[PDB]
Design a protein around this ligand. Structure first.
Ligand SMILES: *[C@@H]1O[C@H](CO)[C@@H](O)[C@H](O)[C@H]1NC(C)=O
Lengths: 50, 42, 50
């Protein structure tokens, strides 16, 4: 499993043309706040290719 | 694309701007390609 | 920037950022040669009704 390639599965807003976002900010995929700590409906923005 | 314009003019007013016309000539088209929203001078 | 016309010496002066000059219809009236920094007028060669 070559997990060296990743993609931004989760993002809050659509990108502008020729935009790069290397920000390591967590996403809140539920009503429950994450506040930078993983948990329930709190997943990493970048997911590795299997 | 980050484009620079400029114009150098000899002035002799002590405090404020003069009144007149002077167009600005482009110098550098700098290819940075980054998000810019808040800047700070020196 | 291809085209067709008569190339003659130019009396106009181009500022250093200027590379070509467009007329009202935005056809290249005067051009700057990329090898020798000299300005050339492009007069379209004669047309008329027969
Ligand atoms: C090559 O082109 C430059 C313009 O970018 C000019 O200044 C130079 O004289 C030219 N050299 C020759 C050998 O044609």
């Amino acid at each position: 499993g070559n997990y060296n390639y990743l993609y931004r599965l989760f993002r809050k807003s659509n990108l502008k043309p020729f935009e790069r976002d290397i920000s390591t900010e967590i996403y809140q995929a539920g009503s429950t706040p994450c506040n930078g700590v993983k948990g329930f409906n709190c997943y990493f923005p970048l997911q590795s290719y299997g | 694309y980050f484009k620079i314009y400029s114009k150098h003019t000899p002035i002799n007013l002590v405090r404020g701007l003069p009144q007149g016309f002077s167009a600005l000539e482009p110098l550098v088209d700098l290819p940075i390609g980054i998000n810019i929203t808040r800047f700070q001078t020196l | 920037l291809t085209g067709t016309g008569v190339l003659t010496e130019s009396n106009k002066k181009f500022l250093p950022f200027q590379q070509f000059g467009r007329d009202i219809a935005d056809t290249t009236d005067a051009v700057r040669d990329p090898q020798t920094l000299e300005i050339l007028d492009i007069t379209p060669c004669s047309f008329g009704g027969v």
